[PDB]
């Protein structure tokens, strides 16, 4: 079994990031804790999430690993509150799934791993031009390039170290500042990247304010997002497409 | 005429319960107090309602029975709110209706009660293994089931005295599980009944939390359920359509 | 220039007025303030918008007019708060828009004022049975003629001084009945007016509670309505077209 009473606050967080990617949930449970990770179909988005040491009360593992009707447990996930622990009992077969919350017993078939998709693997990166950010204006700064350009710019290095959100169109513009003071951390470097806002929509619909955002930035690679989104328990890797940086 | 002040929270819960399953209302007001109650189109939902002594300041009477054009007062008299108090002065006329709150004044048409419907009668039924449990957690039960399984079974009595909510359906099944404590009331018998979730949705669509549900169990035939549904003010019984209890 | 640091809370009534009958803002930068008005297609609303001193914390002028891309600030501008110091910055040139919020600079390509519509002028009218009321019973008077019948009575002068907005149509009517006390002014005259509802609709949906209503009452012409929406420091003029008064 996996015996994980777990706040459900953790909940949402969780099975919902992939969501925005994918459907179905190949599932990692190790001997530190369960994470998750996939490419949606298009392959241009991949979240690796890796859940912690002591986010639920106990747990007991010995590998164990499930692919899950994420596309079922999605809204039935979401009908419960963050301020209730929960419980995940898969000890007695891979083809249910049994939950605990508030009196509520249920039970899923579940799908074998091995029959899904390929589970990716860690592209090997090393960045520099890191950024910081909280969540509230990182997706303030993608409200705003949410319709004069398709997708965002995260140019880094103007004029040596600096940050800029912008998105150029036929007649219009835009352009997100962000200086050093009360930014919580920067890496001065010199790499700028291109992104498709829409793909990052989906992504940070999810992240109103207080998460702290980490952009691996460099140049024109796939950008890497590196989060703990609800009391500082969980990560999110977001690994958006890149583009050509003309403009 | 019929003189009444009523608080202005007994508005939208009196007129909408029946809106589920009719539009046109016939209206009873009788020397106690003024009642409603009929069978939708497909007979698949029948609340009985019945409206009390001195829910309204003062109020006269003497037969004097309406059919109203519920699907015209349903969205004008929701303009409204709870914090006022209405009046019913209809002595004039059965053509018309007026109303008063806060200023305005409505005069509505009213059809004759004897060109409707049938007006049904009360199945005078006696149950065993009554039910009791506030809507909050009725409506969250319903919730449960609302995507599972297409109908709620109230399975009663599950190894003595027992409820339950759950829903099978293919590769996915569901659970409510709800013993005595903290349970306000129990009749602890035999009967368990199945209904269709769906005609039970509508119903408790509009029962949020703090409504005590009362839940009169027996084996597959239509439950009762009475209601007190605002500061304690009123009923709404609802019968559902049996369904054969096989699963 | 335009030097202005506007109030956040300025900027979504200053530039949603007109949008519910324009999309193209002609915009006037006089040296007391910066006003707006025009004529929607149909030719059946025109609201004189005129900004006032001191709005903004500082300014400076001299003639300078723009259109504005309306249906593009329109939303762009909306994704900013109150709580904010806005400014309006147009020196370089009058291809481009640049303003200030929250570390976001913005840059628009601005049409020339002469090529869109002509501009109108102000109706030279006194009216008689001028009304007050605030917006928060207005609209709610609105609420009501919004299903019943299809315009708004104004009607004026119900047995020497009185208010009416009411709404007659087949089998269900409704009335509005508006006395002198605690309505903060009154002028009571003789005249009442007809207008569309719906035209009254788009005007008032913004306009929620505590925004003092005036209404220029005449028989039978465009009925002048006179507001200061936010902190107190704006106007917003909708004349709407009358209709011939029977019934």
Same mark, same amino acid.
């Given at each position: 079994m996996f015996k994980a009473i777990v706040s459900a606050a953790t909940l949402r967080d969780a099975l919902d990031s992939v969501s925005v990617l994918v459907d179905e949930c190949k599932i990692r449970l190790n001997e530190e804790s369960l994470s998750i990770r996939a490419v949606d179909p298009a392959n241009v988005g991949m979240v690796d999430l890796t859940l912690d040491a002591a986010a639920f009360e106990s747990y007991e !593992?010995?590998?164990?690993?499930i692919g899950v009707n994420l596309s079922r447990l999605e809204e039935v996930a979401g009908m !419960? #509150?963050? #301020? =209730?622990? &929960?419980?995940? $009992?898969?000890?007695?077969? $891979?083809?249910?799934? @049994?939950?605990? &919350?508030?009196?509520?017993s249920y039970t899923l078939a579940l799908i074998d791993p091995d029959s899904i998709r390929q589970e990716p693997d860690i592209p090997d990166l090393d960045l520099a031009a890191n950024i910081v950010l909280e969540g509230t204006h990182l997706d303030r700064g993608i409200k705003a390039a949410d319709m004069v350009s398709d997708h965002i710019r995260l140019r880094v290095d103007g004029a040596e170290e600096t940050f800029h959100i912008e998105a150029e169109g036929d007649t219009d513009d835009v352009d997100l500042s962000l200086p050093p003071a009360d930014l919580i951390s &920067?890496?001065? #470097? !010199?790499? =700028?990247?291109?992104?498709?806002? =829409?793909?990052?929509?989906?992504? @940070?619909? !999810? &992240?109103? $304010?207080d998460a702290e955002v980490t952009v691996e930035l460099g140049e024109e690679f796939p950008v890497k997002l590196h989060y703990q989104i609800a009391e500082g328990m969980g990560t999110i890797t977001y690994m958006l497409a890149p583009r050509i940086q003309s403009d």
């Open positions: !593992a010995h590998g164990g690993v !419960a #509150g963050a #301020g =209730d622990l &929960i419980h995940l $009992t898969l000890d007695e077969e $891979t083809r249910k799934l @049994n939950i605990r &919350i508030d009196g509520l &920067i890496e001065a #470097g !010199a790499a =700028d990247s291109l992104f498709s806002l =829409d793909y990052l929509k989906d992504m @940070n619909k !999810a &992240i109103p $304010t």
